[PDB]
Structure formats: structure tokens, C-alpha cells
Design an enzyme around this catalytic site. Sequence first.
Site, short mmCIF file in Angstrom:
data_model
loop_
_atom_site.label_atom_id
_atom_site.label_comp_id
_atom_site.label_asym_id
_atom_site.label_seq_id
_atom_site.Cartn_x
_atom_site.Cartn_y
_atom_site.Cartn_z
N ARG A 110 -9.04 -44.35 -38.68
CA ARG A 110 -9.56 -42.95 -38.60
C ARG A 110 -10.39 -42.45 -37.42
O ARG A 110 -10.58 -41.20 -37.34
CB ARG A 110 -10.57 -42.79 -39.82
N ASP A 111 -10.36 -43.41 -36.38
CA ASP A 111 -11.21 -43.02 -35.14
C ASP A 111 -10.33 -43.22 -33.91
O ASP A 111 -10.78 -43.42 -32.80
CB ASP A 111 -12.45 -44.19 -35.03
N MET A 112 -8.98 -42.86 -33.93
CA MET A 112 -8.10 -42.88 -32.84
C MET A 112 -8.58 -41.74 -31.92
O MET A 112 -8.42 -40.44 -32.60
CB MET A 112 -6.79 -42.75 -33.33
N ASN B 26 -10.67 -44.12 -27.30
CA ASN B 26 -10.33 -45.18 -27.91
C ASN B 26 -9.19 -45.89 -27.55
O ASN B 26 -8.61 -46.80 -28.20
CB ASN B 26 -10.41 -45.20 -29.41
#
Lengths: 273, 193, 636, 638
Positions: free
Chosen positions: B62-64, B68
Site C-alpha cells: 500500500r506504500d509504493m 520507495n
Amino acid sequence: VDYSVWDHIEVSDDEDETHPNIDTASLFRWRHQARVERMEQFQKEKEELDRGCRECKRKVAECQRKLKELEVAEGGKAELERLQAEAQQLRKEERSWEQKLEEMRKKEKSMPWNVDTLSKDGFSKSMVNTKPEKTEEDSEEVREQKHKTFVEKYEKQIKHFGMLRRWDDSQKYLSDNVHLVCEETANYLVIWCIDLEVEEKCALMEQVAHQTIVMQFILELAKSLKVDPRACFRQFFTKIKTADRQYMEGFNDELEAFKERVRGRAKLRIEKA
Amino acid sequence: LLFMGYMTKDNLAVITQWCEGSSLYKHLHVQETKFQMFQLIDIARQTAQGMDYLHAKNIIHRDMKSNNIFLHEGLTVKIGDFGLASVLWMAPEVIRMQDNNPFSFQSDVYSYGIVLYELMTGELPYSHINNRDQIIFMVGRGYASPDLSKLYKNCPKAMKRLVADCVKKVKEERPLFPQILSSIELLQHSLPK
Amino acid sequence: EEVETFAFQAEIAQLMSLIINTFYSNKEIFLRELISNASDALDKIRYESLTDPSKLDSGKELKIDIIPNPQERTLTLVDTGIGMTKADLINNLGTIAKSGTKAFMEALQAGADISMIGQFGVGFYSAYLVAEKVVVITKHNDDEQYAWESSAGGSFTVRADHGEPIGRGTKVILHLKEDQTEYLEERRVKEVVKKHSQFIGYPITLYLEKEREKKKIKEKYIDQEELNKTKPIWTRNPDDITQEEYGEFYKSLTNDWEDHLAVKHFSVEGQLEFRALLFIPRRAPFDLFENKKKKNNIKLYVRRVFIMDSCDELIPEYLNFIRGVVDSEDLPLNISREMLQQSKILKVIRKNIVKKCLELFSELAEDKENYKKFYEAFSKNLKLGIHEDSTNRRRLSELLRYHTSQSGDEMTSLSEYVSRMKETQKSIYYITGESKEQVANSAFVERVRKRGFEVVYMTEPIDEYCVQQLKEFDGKSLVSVTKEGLELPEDEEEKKKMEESKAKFENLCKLMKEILDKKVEKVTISNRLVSSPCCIVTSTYGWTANMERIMKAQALRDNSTMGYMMAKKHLEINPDHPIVETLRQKAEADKNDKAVKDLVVLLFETALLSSGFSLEDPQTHSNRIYRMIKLGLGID
Amino acid sequence: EEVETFAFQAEIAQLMSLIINTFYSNKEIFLRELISNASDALDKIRYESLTDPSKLDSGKELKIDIIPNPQERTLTLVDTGIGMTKADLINNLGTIAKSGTKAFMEALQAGADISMIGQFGVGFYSAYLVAEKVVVITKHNDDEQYAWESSAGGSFTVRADHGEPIGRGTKVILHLKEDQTEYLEERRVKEVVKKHSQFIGYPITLYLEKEREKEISKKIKEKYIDQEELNKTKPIWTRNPDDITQEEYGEFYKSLTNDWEDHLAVKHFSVEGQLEFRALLFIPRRAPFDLFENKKKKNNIKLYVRRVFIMDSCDELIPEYLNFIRGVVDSEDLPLNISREMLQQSKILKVIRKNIVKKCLELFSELAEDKENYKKFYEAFSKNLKLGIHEDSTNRRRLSELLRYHTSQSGDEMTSLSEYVSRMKETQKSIYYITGESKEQVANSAFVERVRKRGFEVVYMTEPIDEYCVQQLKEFDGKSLVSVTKEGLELPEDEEEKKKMEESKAKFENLCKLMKEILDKKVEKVTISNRLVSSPCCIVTSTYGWTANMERIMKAQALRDNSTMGYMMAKKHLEINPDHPIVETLRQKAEADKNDKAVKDLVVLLFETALLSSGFSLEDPQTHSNRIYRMIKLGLGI
Ligand SMILES: Nc1ncnc2c1ncn2[C@@H]1O[C@H](COP(=O)(O)OP(=O)(O)OP(=O)(O)O)[C@@H](O)[C@H]1O
Ligand SMILES: Nc1ncnc2c1ncn2[C@@H]1O[C@H](COP(=O)(O)OP(=O)(O)OP(=O)(O)O)[C@@H](O)[C@H]1O
Ligand SMILES: [Mg+2]
Ligand SMILES: [Mg+2]
């Protein structure tokens, strides 16, 4: 015979399951952060089921007590039937509670192991060694006593090593005879080859002296590389196997110098006597 | 004379051959290192490999984000989340926090579509509002329709449909990652066209 | 529909051929299996004596005898264990994959005080790897002496043993075949026993006729018991063991006599249970990092029988120095008992071994002298762990000790650096170089040391890789002084003077950029020098001077990408130095003076010298210095 | 006597537990074993069809299929092979350690033209690693189809199978455990088939209902897709190494190593004897970014026994310096473990290693003739060649002829040491070389000036691996490699140069000793010889020890011992040029007054510049920088 408890292990920083398109240092932290979350979720689930089971047990005990009280008291037959129906519903809920308990027991069975639950630490003890360092060089006291003990006990080993000439045989023997390599043994070997040159035995002369020079070279190498000569002797043979022709030249020059020195010592001893 | 020894050969051996030495990070969209579509298709393929491998292990991200991601010297991308290195990269379900646990793969595919958009166009998604208050409005309302008009010319059309389907606001119709492997395969096969 | 139930059979001849031929790839494990059987017998007879000592009334000793015999080409292994009746001699030694040890262990389950090495039932037939025909002469306390014998042909014979009587136990006689006569040599037997079964809890004795008597006739037999002289010390409780006993065990483990530095004795209990005993060597081995040495530091033991030595899955490559023994009771073993069925059990073991090793290092960091010796030995391994092991990087970094400006000739810990660090300062200033003196007196550190800020020296090449990954310590980042844009606490006067200086020193900076357009990629003025005119710092992205030197010196590196990640030299000049003042005066008059460009290029080359770089070829610098010395002393 | 003979027996439950639990370390090889059985069955039926094709009327194609069924938690493995009769089903599949394949092979009897991958008889029971119940439904040509079924409970049933009919072959239904369900996914099935049994001689087609049905004029995802991709490539190495063309070799190499470009050179050979094997060795066009990264481990060479994977390359199959070589080694007669994941005789790998190394070096030798391709090979694997020179000692003579170096009479193209020896003069008896840091750093260097003045060649070695190579390489044809950076350099001279040098030494001995006193502990001794032409000073290294570049290399190794860093270093023997103006104009300043501050500073500066030019780093370079700055200030007027 039965390895079915070791077939489900989830090690987080498992080095052999890495994707060359994922950062391994960052892959090993994704696995950890999911593993701990699964543990926390399962812990909360089984804790809430435990407290629900306790609550339902207390409720069914209270309902049974109230049923007994209503049965004792006359005039509450309709209330007795209503409480009987309520207790039947409570017992249905109570028996359904253990269904989820068996479900989570099976889920725990299917849950993989990990380093946190496979083993619980026992009794660990770390304790640091404090021993005197460095050694002393003396021509008396313990060094002479050690010399005498070594020559008395290991005379046969010294003779057998001196009888050998082959580099591979010498390395194998000294691997089985590591005790033969030390400064006191070097002094004994020097005095022994001098005594043999007094006795004029040329074959034994060179046979002892070549290995004496080999051990002196090994000792010099050990002094150079700051590790004990008693263990590094194995590398000198491999060194001389691939050494330069100049190493052979230096070794043979040392051979010649040792021959001349010991011959001079033997001649002086003969002349004095 | 005992000479000096000429011993050598102590530790002149070829000791363990070490590694490391990389090229740069992913935050290069502001450096303007945009190149032809070959080096973009390859990057999309490798990052899709990484995301599909993550999905196989049932790991929710969920944190692409452009922060990152990391590119390596061998033209390989290591998509590892390098900690900090937030806004506009999240999902409506994540922002709403209705369930207090918005961890779902649809968020991953939405973030992947946003990443693909910002990689193929070279510009930030929704590059018309720079206000902190305004950006949260779209995700809070639950209806966010982005625009695709700054696309680089002479590019395969697979990425257009991919980014159109990925950012759609229906959780039951977003494209899965097995679809993405086939899409990137036909994408690299459509390069000479 | 009909169901015709059957039962699984076995082809006995082919099964025996499978056990002999395709079952054990290492032919020397037969001795380990026979000694394990003898140990099991002795364990049985010793456990039975617990209830009543009458069971031991045929000989008090519980020993294992190895009796090589090269006249008849046989190797006899004699134990004084429990023996076995005729019924047992048939059921256990005739039925493949049937274990009397397993039945014995599974029988009690209420007074379990023994750990018996056997559960499969095929281990005995490994004796046929080396023996063409074996004879087993046993004697139980409940039966008469019998003589089992088989040639592995599909049948075995049981007789009444009309010959020499034995009090109790078993006597396995291996008529070794022509090829495998090497197992009668004393050296080979000693090697095999020491490698495989040297912690068996019963005296293993080698018998051979080699000792002379007073000085000929070697008829007397050498009763060499010293095959199993060192007992497993990890079995005893840690409180029960003294430093001397730990040292003796360590010396016996390493085949070289020297005390150890520290010891770790721990155990974990649960589904995976093992006892470990980890030793820090007093001094690092002279071939510690030679990759040709493979890895044998940590040895895995299951019920005191060797299974496998170190692998990359048991101990990380940076902890290859620390040696010990991992002994476990319940491990799923291969049929040959030389590898585990589940290989990630090794990784779960390693997860505990590494944590305990780091705890041992942390507890070792409480006496300064002991840790000083340990660090002098293994700082390279600590830094390799910081580079490689990422999950333990935070704990491993607290084990780093560095030379620094404010400590002198004693290494200091980075936590102590942070303690002494000024409140205004908010970074760890480090300089990576080639020697202690080279970085102590360097251009980059002059201003930082003048203002009192502490600087961490990093001399060894291992430090480049250590700080590749150590980008932060205790929340305050590590910034090099060789990198451009060194952020320093600026006072009002200093920053005003700096603005005035770059407002004054722009013409010669443009001149520098013009004359040096390819070599130098930026010329500017920064306040990090006090007594030097120019130093070349490297851009914030890429390789530093020292790092570029190290990576260029690597024997096996892809030279194609050396220019891919090369440094970006940013020559900078010190405004307060008289040389740059004179140079600015001379450049203001004209930009094309020969002396100006000569002095500028020579300053750049001498700063390439000072900053740690190397020239494209130093012959040009030498030639220009020779022309200048000729001009100075006047020989044209 | 009283002898009494018994017969060996077995405990069947315990033996089955041993097979299931303590034989195979990886559960995924059950698929390899089942596919091996299918291949053996297909070989049986094909070989029997060669004699009488009348028994191939019950089906024609010889094909292995895997049909995962995630709904029912099963993994069927159908096969149109030979099947088994009721007697064969009872014996071969019921009696442990009995193999029907071995019996069939022993019945070939002078006419054996096939190979089989079954000999033990325990392989089938590996299916209980993952499957709790195995249902085998077989159909022979001359027997009705029976449904064998067991749960490894010590018993099995053999019914009549009144169900759906099959023409021939076996249908091994596995009912996988509740937790061994990862083997129903396409990922794991494809991984296992690719790893273990990707070269099985029959098409292994995998089935799954994942096809997206065409819909136009919805989103249907239920349709079986026959993916024969598991076994697309064929075992090319089974063919003759002469009837294959380079395009076939390249296609096989691209498929095997997933390279986007074909191979560079290919060696295809096979040796017949007690140890037989067919080996196919490729040289990759471009070396991998992590070729020497040993932490990546090694799988370059793959060992196959009868087209079934055994083990990827270990340290004992190929030398570390030939780890760029990709290929396969396939042997028909290799004794294997019970797990078939290793050889029984690990000493066999040494003979294979000897043969593989000899053939790889022969490949390099036959490649060198085409210089156009040899340049491409060398500019990628010169490091490996030099590492082989350093490590390998028996092939050093053969491996040295593959070395290409820059010399002073070549220019931008590398040339071999044989071309050197061709162009050496009659009076030259050595091969001169220099180890530096760059090509230009040594092309114009102090030690090479006189040598190029006399028109000798100098080999320029500008790589760190070259010092390792040449500390082991000590001769070539009889011309020893003599560095020009070391002391005691002798060039072919005559009486005239000898007497001139003697005169120069006798004249400058006072200057040399004075310089030695000035440089007391920084230079071992000061010399004079014929090495320089236009330079005043250059420091050479003792005749044995560490040259400047060698010390520079070994001082920059990350994992090096920090205790022998002073016991091997150079014995700096400074040399002066008795013809340069600088040193002789300070000879007068020496003989006029030995103790002179100007002379002190000049000697120290000259030695420091010689230190920088030769390669030695300054002990503290800030001192040299400070004296440069002082000299600039003095000669500049400030
Ligand atoms: N010296 C001995 N004394 C008594 N019994 C013995 C002796 N040697 C062998 N046996 C018997 O032989 C039986 C089977 O031997 P084998 O070594 O093959 O099995 P095991 O001990 O269970 O070993 P493994 O499980 O390692 O294969 C044992 O159960 C034991 O009863
Ligand atoms: N699909 C099949 N078709 C025909 N025969 C089969 C099939 N599967 C098994 N068999 C028969 O069952 C026998 C026993 O099976 P198993 O796989 O254990 O033996 P194997 O292949 O000979 O042994 P291994 O592969 O371990 O060397 C085989 O020898 C073969 O005769
Ligand atoms: Mg046993
Ligand atoms: Mg098989």
C-alpha cells in the site's frame, strides 16, 4: 520416522528465498512486520475467545442457579419454563463457543513455526576468560626443565622426525607430531647435530641438519607473521612447493652456512678434547 | 648466516570478492533523466516482477512511491521500501479509515497504477493542485478521476489501458497482477511496432 | 465393485543392495554407526543397572574396544553393553528397518533418563560398506553366547559359539574386503573416531601392537584409550564448570593449545532444543578470511554424534571466527545422519547463535582491556557484519571503536562520541584515509579540529564498506569531511565573511573552471581549511577519494563501470591563504599569464596529492616540479 | 555343528516411514519422481512399439499431463505410456524396493536401445511426501484398467475401476494434504518441472482453468489452457556434435540461460569409457555483473543423469576461475544416492573436472585463432584467465598462451606473449614488463625510458589481477618475466657502457652515501644503474618482495590481515641518473659542503617526487604539499 512437526517453519530473514529485484535488507523487514502482526491478531483472537468462554461459563452457572431457585419456589412454573428456554439458548451458545476453540487449535496446528515459538531460552551464562599474556625467554628455570622432560619423553619422536627427508612425509608427521616444533626443541636439535658432527656420521649429519634448517625457517616465518610456530608449519611446505628459485637459493645458502658453522663447532670441540 | 628469509606467501591470496556500488535512487523524475521507451518498459517490467513476487508471498504494501524504489547499476530495479526515502499516493479506502484496517491488494494495484502513470508521463499525478487541504478532498470524497494527457509520444498503447484500469475506483474490477505480467509481456513484444 | 485389500511387501535382496550401495555416500561412517550401536548397548546395560546391580554382574566396566587386525584383515569392535538374546539377535539384526533401540526407548516413557542414538533400523548394515562378511558374537545375561554371521547375501546363520567366552555384550567382526583395508591403519581409525564419534560417553579404546619393550619385539599391544579422552563439557550445567575446564575443552576442540578469550554457554528449550558452547579465539587465525578454508568452525551434534560442520546456513560469514559446538537432541535427520531433513532448522538455530554471540560481545564490552584485545583481533569481522548483516546492524554498530581527535591513541566508542559531542553539533564527522597520521594532519579536518569538533578517523579499507551501510548512528547522521558541502555550525561573523569572500573570489573561480574544465567539475570557496590553499572534495553523490582508491585496487572488479560511479572533483580554495591572494592579484591584471595557469594547474595537482587522489600520470607532475626546481637553483 | 540359517526380513511400516520421512530433503521432488515414472512408462511402450506396432493401436501420442485440481485438492498426472497389469500393479507398486523398470531393462537383452531413470524401487512412495492418499488408475494393453489406491497405511486396494475409460497408460491421482497445497499453483508446478525434469523426452503439458474467454459484440476466466511450455526445449546434447548448426546451439543457449543474445563459442564433446558423459559448454557473450560474487553461489554447470537434474555445480565440478562457463554435463551411468540429488562416489566429480577443464582450455585455444572473436572473449574474461594462471598450476603453461597484453610496439591492440618472443632481439634474454595503475601511467614512466631508448618491448600490465598473475608466472619458453620496477635490472650492454657506468658510480659514490645519510630510514640504499634517461630519480624495489603496485594493491584489500603489513613491503632502493643536470649540479653542492640546508631540502624533495612517480604513497602527503607551497612562495615573491 515421523517428521511432521518440522515441515512448517517461517524464518523471516531467510537468505535463500530472496528476489534479485527486491532489497534483501528491506525484504527481511517486510516479513518480520507481517509475522508480528499475525501473532498479535491471533493473540487478540484467542484472548477474546477465552474471555467469552469464561463469560458464558459464568452466565450458564448463574442461569442454572436461578433455575434451581425458581424450581424451589412455588408459583413460578411459567417463569420456570421461560428460564428453561433461556438456559437452553445459553447452553447452545456455550457448546458453540468450543467450536471456535477447536477451530483456533487447528489453526495453531497449521500455523508455521518461527524462531520466537520454536524454542524458549533456557539458562544462558556468559563468562569472560582472564589469563596472563606473553611468554619469557630464559636459559634456566622452567625452560631447562621443559627441555629435559621433552628430551626424556619425546626422544623417539625427535629421532624419527630427524630420520625423515621428504617434505610431504615431514608435514604429515609434524601434523601428527605438532609437539616437536618449539624453541627448546630447536636448541636440542642444534646441540644434537653438533654432537653428531662430533661423531662424524655424514648421512645422519645432513639428514638431521636439513630438517633442522627447515624447522628454523618455519620458526622464522612464525616470528614474522605473529602466529605460533606449532600450527603454521603446514604452510611452509606448500610455500616451498610453489616458492621462487630465490627461496631455494636462500634455503641452500642457509644449509651451507649451517654446515660450515657446525663443522667449525665440531672441529673446535675435537681440538679442545 | 640466517639471511632474512624471503618468506612471503602469508596472505597474498585473492581474498573474498566483495560487492556493492549502485547507480542512484528512484527520485529522478525531478532530475529529468527521461529516456526512450525501452528503458521505461524494462523498468516497468522489473518493478512488476517485484510487485508480483511480493503479492505471491501475501505481503501487503500500500506504500509504493517514487521514494520507495531504487535503481541498481545492472539496470535492475530493487523496489525495496527504503524507509522514508505519504500524500497523493494513497487510496480512498486507506484515507477513509472506515474499517481501521485498509490493508488490501486493491490499494497495491492502485498505487502501482499511479506509479506507472508518474513513470510513463514523467509528471506527478493530479499535477494541478499543490495545496495540502485540497489534495485530501478527492480521496475523502471517494471519487477521484485523474487525467492522462501528458503522455510521451511514440509509446506502446498497452500502458494506457493498464493505467486506465489500475486507477479505477471499483475494488472488484481492478486488474490483478497475473494480468500485469501478460500485459508487460505483450508490451515488450509490441516495442518494434 | 470389489475391493481386494493387500499388504505392502519388500524385495529383501534389492533392499539390502539399496542399503549397501545407494544409502551412505561416505564409506567411513560405518565406524560411527558401529560405535553408536555399542554406545546404545552400554546405555541399555547401564540403565538396567539403575533398578538392580545384578544385571551388571558380568564385568563392571562399560567400554568400547576397537581391535584392528591386519593378519586376518579384520576389524573387531567389542563392547560390554547389553548384548542380545537369540530372539533379539534375529528380530533386531535380521529384520531390516527394525530397531531394538527404538523399542527399548519407547518401552519406558516413565523413567526416561537416557538419550539413545538410534531409531531407523538400517544403521548396522552400513558395516557392509567396508566388510565383505561380518560376524556378530553376542552374549546377553538371559541367553547363551551366540554367533550371528552373514555375507549380506540374503541369509544369516546363528550358532552357539563353541569358542572363546565373553562375559557380556557384543563383538562385531568385520572381515574387511580387499579394497577397504585402509581402515586397519592406526592413523585412519584415529581420524575417523575423532571426527565422528569422539564425544561418545564411553571409553573408546584402540588396540594395536606397536609399542616396544626393553628395545625390540613390539608384541605388546598399545591400549590407546585416548580416542575419546575429551568428554563433552557442554552437558554439565554452566555453574558447575570452571574457567580451567572451559579452557581445556577449547584447547581440545581446536587441535592447538592456547586459552580462549570468552565463552558462551547457553541452551534453548522447546520444540527445537539444543545446548551450545561458543568460544572466542584468543587471536584471529592466520587464514581466517581465506575462502579456500571452507568453514568448519561450528560443529552440529545430535545426541553427541557429529552430523555436520559449519555452513552458511548455520553461522554468518562474518562470525566465521567464533568456534563452538551446537548439540541437539531432537533433530530430523537424513537416513545417513549427515544432514537434517528440514534445512531451515539450521537457520532457526543460526538466529539464536547470532543473537547469543552479539550478547557475548556486548557483555565482553565491560572490561576495556579484554575488549581492546578482542577488537584488535576481530574489528574486521565486526565491520563486515555491519556491512552484511542488516538485521543486527544497530546492535553491531555499538561495538565499533574508532580512533578520533579528542581521544588520542585510544579507540573510543561512537556512543561516547555522541556523549561528548556538542549540543550545537548534529552530525558525526568522519574522515576515511590511508593511515593514522595521513588523516590526522589533513586539509579537510583543519577547520573542524580548530573549532573543537571531534572527528572520527577511519584508516582501514574495511571502513569504506562499514560506512556505506552505516548512514546513521543514534539518530545523528554520519557525514564525511571529504564530501562537498560540509555543513558546519556557522556563526554570524563567519557566514558574513564567507558571503563577502564568494562575492570577492568569483573571477579566479571562473578562471579555474575555464582552465580546468574536464578535470574539475566545480570550483568554489568553502570554510573547511585554515592553513592550506586548496583541497579537492568530492561531490555528495559518488565515490570519495579513498573509496575510489579502494575500489580501483580490487583485483576482481568489473572495470567497465569504474567510470560509471567515479568521483566528481570539486576543487575549493581557501580565501585567507596568501597564495590565493597573490593569485587573485595576478589574475586581475590578466587572465592569460603563463605564470597564472602554471601555478593554477600545479595547485590542482598538489591538491590531488593532498586529497588522496592519484594523477592520470605523475610523470607530468614530476617533470613540472623538476623544471621548477631547476628554475629555482638556476640550471635552465 | 548347530548352525541354523534364517532369511533377512523387513519391518514394512518402519521402512515406509523411512522412505517418506528420511530419504528426500525437499518435498517438491515427488513431481520429479512421478514424471520420471511417466517417462519410463513411455519409453517402455515406445520400445515395445518398435518391434510390434500393433500394440500402439490403443492411442498414439506419448505425452505427460499434469492436471492440478484446486477444487478437490488433487493433482492428477495422466500419461499415455504402457500401464500395468494387475500382477504388475500388485508387485511393482506394492512391493517396496522392487522395480519393474529394472526388470524390463534387464529383459532388453542385446537390443537395448533405450535408457531408463528408474532402478531402486522406492521412488513412487515419495508421493506421500505431499499426498496423503495416492490413487493410481492404470490400464495395460492386455488387461482391464484397475484403480490402485493407498494411504501408506500398510495396505492398498486394487479394484476393477468401472469408471471413465482410458486407452492406455497410468493416471496417478494424488490427494494432496491440507497444507501441501502450494503444488496446485502454476508457479510451483512450473518451478519444479523447470528445475528437475525440464529435459524429459516427452511433452509435459500443464492444465489450468485460467484462460480469459473471448467476449465481444463477460470477463470469463474459466477455461483450460494446455501449456506445453514446461518442456519446449529439447536435450540438444544428445545429438551428434557435427549435425547441429550454430543457430540451434544459440537457441538452446538462450533458452537454458535466458540470455537475450546467443552464445559466443560452444564446446560440445563426449567421452566414452568407464566414466561416460556428454558435455555441452558455452562461453557467455557478456560476463554477468556479479560473476565473481561468490555469495551468489554457483549454478553455472548443471549435472544431469539421463536427462534428469541431479545437482547444480559445486566447488568440485568446475574451477572457480571457469565459473563463467554455462552448460550441462549429462551422464548415463553414475551411481546416485537414494534421493538422486547427489552422486555416491564424490571422487567421480574429479575425473569429470579434469575432462571439463581440458576441453574448456581446448575451446579457448581453438577460439584464439579467430582474433575477431578472441578479442571479444578476452576483453570479458581476461580476469578469469589471469585467475586461472594464479590458482591453477597444472594448466598454467597452456593458460599462459591465452594472455594478451599491451606492449610498447603494439599501440592500441593487445598482443600475446608469443608475438613478444617472436620480436625479441638475439641478445635479449628476458621479457620486460611493468605493473602500473593505468596505461598512460606506465607508458611514459621513469623505469621505461632507457628500455624504449634501446628499442626493447615492455609489456604494460595495468590491472590489479596482473600482479597476482605475474608473481606466479615466472617464465615463457625460457624467457623469464623481469619487472623494470625492481632492482638489479640488467640490459644487454658492452664494455663501453660497463666502464662508463663504473666511472659514474666511482664519481657519485660520495653523493650516494650522503643522500643515504640524509634519507637514513626512508631509503634502504641509494644506487646508480642504467634505467633512466630524462629523469633524475626513481626508486626501485628489492629483487624480491613487493613492488610499488603490489604493495598498493595489498594495502587496499578490505579483508586483509593487519599484522603482516610491514614484513613484506618494498625495500626502496633509490636510484639517481648520473647524466641529468639536477643531480650532478647538486653533486657539486655536495662535495663543496656535505651539510647544507639547501641540499637537505633538495634531496628530500627529489626523493618525495621519486616516491610519487614510482607509485609509493607519501607517508604524510601534507608534508610534501607544505614544501611545495613554501617553494612556490619562495620562487613567487611572497
Ligand atoms: N553392540 C550391540 N549391542 C546390542 N545390540 C546391538 C549392538 N549392535 C547392534 N545392536 C542391535 O541392532 C539393532 C539394529 O541395529 P542398527 O544399528 O541397524 O539400528 P539402530 O541402532 O536403530 O540405528 P540407525 O537408526 O542409526 O540406523 C539395534 O536395535 C540393536 O538392538
Ligand atoms: N506411470 C507408471 N507407468 C508404468 N509403470 C509405473 C508407473 N509408475 C510406476 N510404475 C512402476 O512401478 C515401479 C515402482 O515405482 P518406483 O517409481 O518407486 O520405481 P522406480 O522408478 O523403478 O525407482 P526409482 O525411480 O526410485 O529409481 C516402477 O519400477 C515401474 O515398473
Ligand atoms: Mg545406531
Ligand atoms: Mg521413478
